[PDB]
Amino acid sequence: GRLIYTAGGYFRQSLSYLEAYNPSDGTWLRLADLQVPRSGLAGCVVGGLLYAVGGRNNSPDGNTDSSALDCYNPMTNQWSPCAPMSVPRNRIGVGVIDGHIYAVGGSHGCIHHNSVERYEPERDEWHLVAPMLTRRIGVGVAVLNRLLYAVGGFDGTNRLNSAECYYPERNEWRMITAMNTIRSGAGVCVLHNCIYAAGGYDGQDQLNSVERYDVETETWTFVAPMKHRRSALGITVHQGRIYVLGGYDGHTFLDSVECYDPDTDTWSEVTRMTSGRSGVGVAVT
Ligand SMILES: COc1ccc(S(=O)(=O)N(CC(=O)O)c2ccc(N(CC(=O)O)S(=O)(=O)c3ccc(OC)cc3)c(OCc3ccccc3)c2)cc1
Ligand code: NA
Ligand code: NA
Ligand code: NA
Ligand code: NA
Ligand code: NA
Ligand code: NA
Ligand code: NA
């Protein structure tokens, strides 16, 4: 009975919600608010704990990019602060390898980072690792075969179809085949040994298209598109299906949650969030 957690987000201002969806019975839990509102963050899980990484607090009274790392324990319904990153990272990407959290890219003001740093929960410390070949904000991250992939984003000048691969044992990055479509703000995840990139913004339109990367054929292939165009959607995988949550469709902040079934190559609407929002962090535990 693992749950889909969605933390933070944006609607008129950065949000503090933590809510958890149960796909088996369709219920939503309202859990402890974040201590500081944040949008453009990422979520991940290590050791059954949920982590909220990076983002920004955009409020009527100011706009502050976040270096914060905060840890939610489902057993206690409590957020605890952790050591902060070396730099604020709004529109960050995150992946986990061997129980370590990798924070990639994101922005601080107009600085678009290529830097990458790694968090060790047992010692509550961050350390920089090799930087990406490309500056990327609004970047999607996938972990596959104990390699970390950074997909798409915005380099400060252009939205990107490029993607690159981090080798943790070697501490180095290499460019891989570029996507079919330029995507900033896509949801990026791993399902059945392929990397999926769904939605995003190509510099003109919000996208409903979805493409997936086969690391051996080194080819991106379109699959069925989502029912809603969305950028800055949340994304996760639960019991062999992709879930996308919220995002902005060009006009409204969506509450729609769609579900992709790889066996039938179809998307379905499965639930709604309790309010529309974009820029959430999402993880499963
Ligand atoms: C008013 O609406 C929104 C939508 C989302 C957010 S937000 O807080 O969640 N946030 C920023 C963050 O986190 O600081 C963000 C996320 C996603 C995006 N997008 C693009 C992407 O993904 O790179 S986009 O949704 O497709 C979009 C939204 C507005 C827009 O205006 C013309 C054009 C595109 C995004 O674009 C900003 C933008 C504005 C003008 C021109 C180009 C980009 C911003 C806030 C307000
Ligand atoms: Na809120
Ligand atoms: Na603020
Ligand atoms: Na419990
Ligand atoms: Na700085
Ligand atoms: Na920069
Ligand atoms: Na650790
Ligand atoms: Na290094």
Determine whether the shortest distance from the Cβ of 11 to ligand 1 is under 6 A. no
> Which-ligand-closest: CA of 154?
1
> Which-ligand-closest: CA of 1?
4
> Which atom of ligand 1 is least distant from the CA of 278?
9
Q: What's the CA-to-centroid distance between 69 and ligand 8, angstroms?
A: 21
Determine whether the shortest distance from the Cβ of 105 to ligand 1 is under 6 A. no
Residue 210 burial (C-beta neighbours within 10 Å; 0-12, 13-18, 19+): buried
CATH architecture for the domain at 1-285: 6 Propeller (2.120)
Q: What CA–CA distance (Å, rounded) separates 214 from 62?
A: 43
Q: What is the largest CA-CA distance in the chain?
A: 50
The DSSP bridge pattern shows strands 194-198 and 187-191 to be antiparallel
What is the four-CA torsion angle of 143, 145, 148, 151, rounded to 10 degrees?
A: -70
Determine whether the shortest distance from the Cβ of 39 to ligand 1 is under 6 A. yes
Distances (CA, A) of 113 to 89, 159, 197: 8, 14, 21
CA-wise closest residue to 100 among 82, 115, 122, 78: 122
Determine whether the shortest distance from the Cβ of 206 to ligand 1 is under 6 A. yes
How many residues does this entry show for the chain? 285
CA-wise closest residue to 98 among 125, 119, 74: 119
Core vs surface per residue 152-187: b (16+ CB within 10 A) or e: bbbbeeebbbbbbbbebeeeebeebeebebbbbbbb
Distances (CA, A) of 56 to 24, 60, 182, 194: 32, 13, 24, 30
User: Can you spell out the DSSP letters for the chain?
Assistant: ---EEEE--EESEE---EEEEETTTTEEEEEPPPSS--BS-EEEEETTEEEEE--EEEETTEEEE---EEEEETTTTEEEE-PPPSS--BT-EEEEETTEEEEE--EETTEE---EEEEETTTTEEEE-PPPSS--BS-EEEEETTEEEEE--B-SSSB---EEEEETTTTEEEE-PPPSS--BS-EEEEETTEEEEE--B-SSSB---EEEEETTTTEEEEEPPPSS--BS-EEEEETTEEEEE--B-SS-B--EEEEEETTTTEEEEEEE-SS--BS-EEEE-
> Which atom of ligand 1 is least distant from the CA of 184?
23
Q: What CA–CA distance (Å, rounded) separates 250 from 247?
A: 9
- Laid out side by side, the sheet with 18-22 consists of 27-31, 18-22, 4-7, 281-284
Distances (CA, A) of 169 to 43, 77, 93, 97, 150: 24, 36, 20, 11, 17
- Give the environment of ion ligand 7: residues with CB less than 5 A: 120-122
What is the four-CA torsion angle of 53, 134, 168, 165, rounded to 10 degrees?
A: 110
Residue ranges of the domains in the chain? 1-285
Determine whether the shortest distance from the Cβ of 14 to ligand 1 is under 6 A. no
Residue 112 makes CB contacts below 8 A (sequence gap 6+) with 105, 135, 136, 137, 154, 155, 156
Match 């324990």 to its residue by tokens. Answer: 73
Q: What CA–CA distance (Å, rounded) separates 283 from 281?
A: 7
